[PDB]
Structure 1
Amino acid sequence: GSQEVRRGDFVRNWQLVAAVPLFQKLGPAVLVEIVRALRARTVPAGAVICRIGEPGDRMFFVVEGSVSVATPNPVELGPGAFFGEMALISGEPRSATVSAATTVSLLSLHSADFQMLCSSSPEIAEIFRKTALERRGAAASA
């Protein structure tokens, strides 16, 4: 039926998640649950992480490898690079195609997980909304 899988990058995933700012105002139990709700997946070279204008409702973090961003310029991200916050912000469309330039490894995180913990904790919803309202208030560019 169902089964479990060990974890070695648990620490790297803890820092990856704990590295997230939107999760900086989160708790340890929430971070632990989030990390435990994270799904580690190996992305081979050529494998696309996310398509263009994806259904903003999932997060992904890079642990090892170099990912690229489909844009008007060659955007490449190294290890420890995270992305998907925007989706967790307002389920916005990626607005670009993310693919692994080589044997990269990242972990996915269904936005449902964040919504579950956000719904579970009112403080997280308040802090999340506050940051979301502040972030939405004015984007960051230039």
Structure 2
Amino acid sequence: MSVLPFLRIYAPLNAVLAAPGLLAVAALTIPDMSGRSRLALAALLAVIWGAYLLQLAATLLKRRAGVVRDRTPKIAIDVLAVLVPLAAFLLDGSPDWSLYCAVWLLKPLRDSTFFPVLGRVLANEARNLIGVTTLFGVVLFAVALAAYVIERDIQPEKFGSIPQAMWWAVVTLSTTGYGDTIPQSFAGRVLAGAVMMSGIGIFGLWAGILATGFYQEVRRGDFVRNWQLVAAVPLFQKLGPAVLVEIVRALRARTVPAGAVICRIGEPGDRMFFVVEGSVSVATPNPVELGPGAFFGEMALISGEPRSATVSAATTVSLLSLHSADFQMLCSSSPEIAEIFRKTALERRGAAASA
């Protein structure tokens, strides 16, 4: 609610091409298909093959920034991106060679930041996942066994064994309920009353494990990435130690590209920003072009009024952002700073039109 995400977060074309590339599989997988487009998309594999391959050797030019680096992850797919289709072409002479479109699926995961953020937390909380998983194994066979006791008599063909009744556990416990084999007697139907009750409590915890410290990590990602963009601000020599931990939870940083709009005039004032690197276009008769280490919006937050200038991203600006409360928090946190923002709430009134 308090950020301007721009400049193509889904930027690199290395990620883009797996999307059209993998859909090239399906037409090959289908009978009664004309040979025209059958082979036309096979080229598109060769294109993406050639495309990454063109990228590839430029990636294997890893003399860029070569001081100390850990690029086993980022290289691990680019290598196999072209080898696996290549060796696939010859040994697998039949058209099944295309079934190695399991390979590009890591290419999104190659440059998928937020995926290492995922795997980071599992190596702390998997202590719980296992005891829950074992417990899920407890509750599975503890329950899957209870049915073989009963309907093996009149349902041999469906419940004439245990693992057939392990199927009907997770189908019945994991909220799904296909509808292939269902009991007939009374007692087997009684048992389900706790099953759904159980699995919705298990997953009521187990899925809870993920979002639990995940949110800690994503809420943490807004700090580790943003203890930077702190010292750059010329004013923040006076902020107390504990003051910052209160604040940085809310301040998210994103970048706007050149030419784009930051805050349009007349739209309702609801937030203020801290420019820290780049430049803007404060649309006034004398443009107050504020560069690295500036801010604007207090003119709108103190009064609660529309925007006083169409600020456009004249360049690629690394932006911060902040709504009222957490700035009202700051104005409440210290009178020493509200003074200059009161002054600035008068200076920028005349300094917007003047120089």
Superposition TM-score, scaled by structure 2 size: 0.29
Counterpart contact for 2:299–2:308, Cα < 8 Å: no
Name the SS of the counterpart of 1:141 in structure 2.
Answer: coil
Deviation at 1:49, TM superposition (A): 1.1
Deviation at 1:74, TM superposition (A): 2.8
Whole-angstrom CA distance in 2 between matches of 1:139 and 1:35: 29
**1:84-129 CA distances to partner (integer Å, 9 max, x unpaired)?**
1223322232221011111111111111323467789999999999
Counterpart contact for 1:38–1:107, Cα < 8 Å: yes
**1:9-40 CA distances to partner (integer Å, 9 max, x unpaired)?**
97996797799899999754344322331121
Counterpart contact for 2:262–2:311, Cα < 8 Å: yes
Q: Which has the higher contact order (CA 8 A, sep 6+)?
A: 1
Larger Rg: 2
Counterpart contact for 1:62–1:82, Cα < 8 Å: yes
Whole-angstrom CA distance in 2 between matches of 1:6 and 1:31: 15
In the alignment, structure 2 segments of 5+ residues that lack a partner are 1-215
Deviation at 1:78, TM superposition (A): 0.7
Counterpart contact for 1:61–1:107, Cα < 8 Å: yes
Deviation at 1:46, TM superposition (A): 1.5
Q: Which residue number in structure 2 is paired with residue 141 of structure 1?
A: 354
In the alignment, structure 1 segments of 5+ residues that lack a partner are none
Deviation at 1:44, TM superposition (A): 0.5
Deviation at 1:77, TM superposition (A): 1.0
RMSD: 4.8
Deviation at 1:131, TM superposition (A): 11
Name the SS of the counterpart of 1:63 in structure 2.
Answer: strand
Q: Which residue number in structure 1 is paired with residue 318 of structure 2?
A: 105
Name the SS of the counterpart of 1:26 in structure 2.
Answer: coil
Distance 1:81 1:136, change over 3 A: closer
Counterpart contact for 1:49–1:100, Cα < 8 Å: yes
Whole-angstrom CA distance in 1 between matches of 2:284 and 2:340: 32
Distance 1:28 1:18, change over 3 A: farther
Larger deviation, residues 118-127 vs 85-94? 118-127
Counterpart contact for 1:52–1:95, Cα < 8 Å: yes
Counterpart contact for 1:63–1:79, Cα < 8 Å: yes
Whole-angstrom CA distance in 2 between matches of 1:131 and 1:70: 18
Whole-angstrom CA distance in 1 between matches of 2:345 and 2:331: 13
Deviation at 1:79, TM superposition (A): 0.1
Pick aligned residue for 1:83 from 274, 292, 296: 296
Distance 1:56 1:140, change over 3 A: same
Larger deviation, residues 132-141 vs 70-79? 132-141
Superposition TM-score, scaled by structure 1 size: 0.62
Number of aligned residue pairs: give it: 140
Counterpart contact for 1:17–1:31, Cα < 8 Å: no
Counterpart contact for 2:272–2:296, Cα < 8 Å: yes
Name the SS of the counterpart of 1:60 in structure 2.
Answer: strand
Q: Which has the higher helix share?
A: 2
Q: Which residue number in structure 1 is paired with residue 264 of structure 2?
A: 51
Larger deviation, residues 40-49 vs 87-96? 87-96
Larger deviation, residues 38-47 vs 124-133? 124-133
Whole-angstrom CA distance in 2 between matches of 1:81 and 1:9: 20
Larger deviation, residues 48-57 vs 3-12? 3-12
Deviation at 1:72, TM superposition (A): 1.3
Q: Which has the higher strand share?
A: 1
Distance 1:129 1:81, change over 3 A: closer
